[PDB]
Amino acid sequence: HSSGLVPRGSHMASMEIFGKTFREGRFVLKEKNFTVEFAVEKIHLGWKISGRVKGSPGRLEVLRTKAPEKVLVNNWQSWGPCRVVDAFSFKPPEIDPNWRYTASVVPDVLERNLQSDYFVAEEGKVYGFLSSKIAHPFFAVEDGELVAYLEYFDVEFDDFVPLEPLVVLEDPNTPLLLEKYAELVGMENNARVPKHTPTGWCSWYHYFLDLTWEETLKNLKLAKNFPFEVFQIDDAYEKDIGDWLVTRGDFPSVEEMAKVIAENGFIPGIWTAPFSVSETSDVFNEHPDWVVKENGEPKMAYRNWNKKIYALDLSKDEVLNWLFDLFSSLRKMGYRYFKIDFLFAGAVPGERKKNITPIQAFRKGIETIRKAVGEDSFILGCGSPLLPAVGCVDGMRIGPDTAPFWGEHIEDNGAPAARWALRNAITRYFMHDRFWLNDPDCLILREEKTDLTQKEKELYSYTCGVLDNMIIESDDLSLVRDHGKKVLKETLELLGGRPRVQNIMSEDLRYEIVSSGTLSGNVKIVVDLNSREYHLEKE
Numbered sequence: 291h292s293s294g295l296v297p298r299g300s301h302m303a304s305m306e307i308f309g310k311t312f313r314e315g316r317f318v319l320k321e322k323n324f325t326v327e328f329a330v331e332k333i334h335l336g337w338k339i340s341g342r343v344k345g346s347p348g349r350l351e352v353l354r355t356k357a358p359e360k361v362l363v364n365n366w367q368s369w370g371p372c373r374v375v376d377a378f379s380f381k382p383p384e385i386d387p388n389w390r391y392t393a394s395v396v397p398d399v400l401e402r403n404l405q406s407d408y409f410v411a412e413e414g415k416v417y418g419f420l421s422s423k424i425a426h427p428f429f430a431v432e433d434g435e436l437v438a439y440l441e442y443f444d445v446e447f448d449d450f451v452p453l454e455p456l457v458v459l460e461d462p463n464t465p466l467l468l469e470k471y472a473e474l475v476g477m478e479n480n481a482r483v484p485k486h487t488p489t490g491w492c493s494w495y496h497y498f499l500d501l502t503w504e505e506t507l508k509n510l511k512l513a514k515n516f517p518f519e520v521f522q523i524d525d526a527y528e529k530d531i532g533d534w535l536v537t538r539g540d541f542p543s544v545e546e547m548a549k550v551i552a553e554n555g556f557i558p559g560i561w562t563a564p565f566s567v568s569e570t571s572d573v574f575n576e577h578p579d580w581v582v583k584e585n586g587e588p589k590m591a592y593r594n595w596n597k598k599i600y601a602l603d604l605s606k607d608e609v610l611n612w613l614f615d616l617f618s619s620l621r622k623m624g625y626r627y628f629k630i631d632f633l634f635a636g637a638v639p640g641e642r643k644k645n646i647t648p649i650q651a652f653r654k655g656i657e658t659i660r661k662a663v664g665e666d667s668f669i670l671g672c673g674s675p676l677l678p679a680v681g682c683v684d685g686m687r688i689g690p691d692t693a694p695f696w697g698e699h700i701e702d703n704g705a706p707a708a709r710w711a712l713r714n715a716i717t718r719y720f721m722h723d724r725f726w727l728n729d730p731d732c733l734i735l736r737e738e739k740t741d742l743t744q745k746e747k748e749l750y751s752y753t754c755g756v757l758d759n760m761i762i763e764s765d766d767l768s769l770v771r772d773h774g775k776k777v778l779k780e781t782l783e784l785l786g787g788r789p790r791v792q793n794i795m796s797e798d799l800r801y802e803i804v805s806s807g808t809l810s811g812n813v814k815i816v817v818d819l820n821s822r823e824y825h826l827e828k829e
């Protein structure tokens with residue numbers, strides 16, 4: 291009555307799991323420096339590999355199989371591409387040293403080989419890891435083979451710790467597979483998926499760093515005529531990166547800002563970059579030992595605001611206690627919506643006080659933030675590693691920044707452009723209502739001080755509505771007139787459904803997207819991001 295299963299098909303015959311022929315079973319791999327105990331089990335729509343590892347697994351090879359020609363690949367963080375690429379014509383990108391870790395947490399890979407983080411898909415199969423709690427899970431294409439790895443960053447384990455589980459799903463319906471992968475991720479990490487999604491206003495994509503409190507107050511008054519729940523102050527108010535409770539210019543205190551917003555009937559929101567401290571900040575120069583190091587010196591995590599930005603060492607209790615105090619204080623002031631940006635800084639490789647992986651460090655930081663703000667606060671992640679944030683954040687930015695222009699000829703390289711922001715909202719659609727609520731970035735609906743056309747505004751906004759994503763507007767509200775108000779109202783009527791991108795493996799920016807059971811019934815939108823055209827059907 292033996293009941294173990296083995297793949298029947300010829301492609302699956304290439305599969306090697308921890309050096310073993312792929313079939314159901316329990317297995318052990320003993321190497322010089324580590325030991326893995328693992329199990330392969332048949333699950334609905336595929337297979338699941340799980341287990342435990344001890345020793346020094348380093349860059350642990352999990353799976354090797356033949357590489358498909360056309361693969362949907364995924365960058366580890368918000369801004370980076372999720373796109374279909376030819377596996378064999380890859381050339382190593384030039385990586386800007388100011389933003390190296392946005393490209394990859396293991397840039398040594400990306401400098402030689404095509405990399406995908408967390409999952410990779412081909413038409414009819416999905417390979418995907420269900421978590422990133424200790425190791426960083428990634429795939430590389432190495433001379434025609436697709437290889438799955440768990441990167442432990444030289445950390446040694448005296449006792450067994452769990453592997454990040456790997457699934458291999460198979461069915462002709464690729465969107466279904468991605469949706470089922472994401473359901474498994476959500477269960478593995480106890481994803482937060484709020485039943486209510488906030489609407490709101492954000493200052494960034496009109497004012498940028500030039501926001502003043504005078505302009506903020508003008509918008510706070512006008513916002514009373516818009517369907518906004520949250521009113522969120524973005525980067526501009528703070529004296530420096532890390533000095534979150536010190537304000538600049540005409541801004542009142544951080545506490546005062548919250549109270550003005552709340553007295554005006556909005557849920558107050560605030561932006562921080564909580565794992566980042568700039569070289570000029572009070573907090574860094576007061577606590578130079580609080581940052582990740584390289585040869586005992588502070589390691590640059592990225593360069594922005596025209597200065598070197600360092601990463602907080604989230605293995606340190608002093609650091610976690612400082613974050614806890616900060617976010618507790620914010621909650622006490624009345625903020626209930628927190629946009630937390632540049633989160634990848636917390637996971638940069640480097641020297642930390644405790645010998646834990648960068649992913650373990652990251653998880654401690656974001657969990658600390660979660661505890662501080664409480665259950666009833668909404669956390670929106672941004673510039674963030676995706677799988678390690680599941681279970682912590684409520685909302686997640688899943689694309690590069692939008693901008694007040696389309697970017698018809700702008701390179702797909704994670705820089706701001708509405709075309710690529712929207713592309714990622716489409717290709718990472720399946721995370722929505724499974725990992726978290728997807729944030730496609732703000733709608734820019736003004737009719738002046740913008741390079742966007744009316745058709746572009748419609749296309750972006752209606753797509754986001756069909757996708758049931760977060761809807762946040764970012765404009766000088768004075769400059770939003772009848773067209774912009776109408777687009778918003780119509781977008782909000784498209785929400786509420788269960789969306790699917792039906793041709794997720796598309797190579798030419800033309801997508802067919804359906805959503806069942808919206809507030810407008812069943813809907814379909816077909817979009818072309820290069821021609822900037824759409825066709826929308828509503829029941």
Ligand SMILES: *[C@H]1[C@H](F)[C@@H](O)[C@@H](O)[C@]2(CO)C[C@H]12
Nearest residue numbers: 494524525631632672673691
């Ligand atoms: C991170 C966010 F992705 C973006 O929306 C905006 O908040 C800024 C402000 O510095 C770029 C950073």
